[PDB]
Amino acid sequence: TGREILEKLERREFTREVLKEALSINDRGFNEALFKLADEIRRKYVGDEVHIRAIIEFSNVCRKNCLYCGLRRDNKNLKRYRMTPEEIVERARLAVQFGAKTIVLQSGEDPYYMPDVISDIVKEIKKMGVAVTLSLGEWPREYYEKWKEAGADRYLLRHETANPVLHRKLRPDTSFENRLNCLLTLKELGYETGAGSMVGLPGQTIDDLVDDLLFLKEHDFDMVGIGPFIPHPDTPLANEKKGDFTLTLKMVALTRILLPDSNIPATTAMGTIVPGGREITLRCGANVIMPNWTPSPYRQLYQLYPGKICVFEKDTACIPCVMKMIELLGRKPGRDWGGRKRVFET
Ligand code: SF4
Ligand code: SF4
Ligand SMILES: [Cl-]
Ligand SMILES: [Cl-]
Ligand SMILES: [Cl-]
Ligand SMILES: [Cl-]
Ligand SMILES: [Cl-]
Ligand SMILES: [S]
């Protein structure tokens, strides 16, 4: 029954059978109870602070050819850019002046920066007294080592999907096995480590989602980034169906349940498919938000949302925006860097 599954979740009887059934029920009441649960677990384990990770998308060059991704190398209908290192440090400084306690440096897999330019940049931001998160893709162990010694605190490397055949068809440059080795390496070197998947990928079944969850649980990732799949028009998946918001939201809730002291963002994709989607996610298990901090002209001063379309006046609008959001949700800003605090067990 709907009632019995919530009870198995409470006792942490996290079997394949239970996760599958929980993902299979579409009853509104069951869903609402699951979200109140995930929220209650979030309050108890990670508290009311909502942590801001300022994202600087500093280069959109990528060497890989992932099929879902607007940054894939075969996409010629994309203006490519690279910020200078100095532009980056100074932008970060501006973020820090605006209150950001974590800076995320993210890109396509762009060789130009790797490894030394990254190291020098990271060293420089760490002088600024903030946490540093990297999201640069798959690289040799030697690069992860240099960036860890350089002072990086965290690394996001979403696993996207745990079905290896699906992974290899979608990311023909690589494999799930390779992705797993990178995640493992990052964990062993002492990074705060983030994984996660897209939901509603073409060919992905509920069973695959179950496997994603079991995966996350198995490895105890510090962070889990989850969002719905959103077709990108300049890719081979332009014409595939979008991921469902409720289903993705349920993945987020379940993720909080499985990994109660972890950091779970309300991803931008979530705010893209449903109005108020980020806020909704934050009231359903999530405890982090990641505002775009990329400067013009790399970033249009234009953010589509459904119906609405936020036309901001300045480079810097989103940090104040999200602080305001956080305040209005009755949540609290982070007092510290908001890194993972491994409680709940042993
Ligand atoms: S490595 Fe990242 S940026 Fe490059 S195509 Fe794959 S998903 Fe996109
Ligand atoms: S300022 Fe606009 S784009 Fe930025 S987070 Fe707020 S509503 Fe969204
Ligand atoms: Cl990216
Ligand atoms: Cl990415
Ligand atoms: Cl982070
Ligand atoms: Cl996102
Ligand atoms: Cl992003
Ligand atoms: S990435």
CATH code (residue 78): 3.20.20.70
Ligand nearest to the CA of 170: 1
Assigned token pair, 193 = 């480590």
Atom of ligand 2 nearest to the CA of 311: 2
CA distance linking residue 43 with residue 283, whole number of Å: 10
Residue 222 near residue 193, CB atoms below 8 Å: yes
Number of domains in the chain: 1
Angle between helices 116-126 and 85-97 (to 10 degrees): 20
Q: Is residue 137 lining ligand 8, measured as CB closer than 6 Å? A: yes
Residue 94 near residue 316, CB atoms below 8 Å: yes
* Residues in contact with ligand 2 (CB, 6 Å cut-off): 291, 303, 310, 312, 317-318, 321-322
Ligand 1 center–CA 62 separation, angstroms: 6
- Residues contacting 172, CB < 8 A, separation 6+: 65, 67
Residue 89 near residue 306, CB atoms below 8 Å: no
To test the ligand 1 pocket, which listed residue (65, 109, 110, 158) has its Cβ within 8 A of the most ligand atoms?
Answer: 109
Assigned token pair, 254 = 């379940």
Atom of ligand 2 nearest to the CA of 308: 7
Residue 71 near residue 79, CB atoms below 8 Å: no
Annotated binding site for [4Fe-4S] cluster: 62, 66, 69
Counting every residue written for the chain, the total comes to: 346
Residue 286 near residue 280, CB atoms below 8 Å: no
Atom of ligand 2 nearest to the CA of 318: 4
Assigned token pair, 107 = 């890109």
The residue segments making up the domain with residue 85 are: 1-346
Ligand 8 center–CA 274 separation, angstroms: 24
CA distance linking residue 76 with residue 157, whole number of Å: 25
CA distance linking residue 252 with residue 142, whole number of Å: 33
Assigned token pair, 111 = 């060789």
CA distance linking residue 144 with residue 186, whole number of Å: 7
Atom of ligand 1 nearest to the CA of 70: 8
To test the ligand 2 pocket, which listed residue (312, 323, 325) has its Cβ within 8 A of the most ligand atoms?
Answer: 312
234: helix, coil or strand?
A: coil
Maximum Cα–Cα distance across the chain: 58
Nearest alpha carbon, ligand 1 atom 2? 108
Residue 269 near residue 227, CB atoms below 8 Å: yes
Q: Are strands 102-107 and 131-135 parallel, antiparallel or unpaired?
A: parallel
To test the ligand 2 pocket, which listed residue (278, 301, 316, 318) has its Cβ within 8 A of the most ligand atoms?
Answer: 318
Task: Give the start-end residues of each E strand in 182-287.
Answer: 192-195, 198-199, 223-224, 227-228, 265-266
CA distance linking residue 294 with residue 44, whole number of Å: 34
Task: Give the start-end residues of each E strand in the chain.
Answer: 49-59, 102-107, 131-135, 154-156, 192-195, 198-199, 223-224, 227-228, 265-266, 288-289, 303-304, 309-310, 332-333
Q: Is residue 194 lining ligand 8, measured as CB closer than 6 Å? A: no
Ligand 6 center–CA 105 separation, angstroms: 14
CA distance linking residue 125 with residue 88, whole number of Å: 9
144: helix, coil or strand?
A: helix
- Residues contacting 222, CB < 8 A, separation 6+: 154, 191, 192, 193, 194, 262, 263, 339, 340
CA distances 125 to 93, 128, 285, Å, are: 8, 5, 30
Nearest alpha carbon, ligand 8 atom 1? 137
* Residues in contact with ligand 1 (CB, 6 Å cut-off): 62, 64, 66, 69, 71-72, 108-109, 137
- Residues contacting 260, CB < 8 A, separation 6+: 41, 42, 44, 45, 46, 344
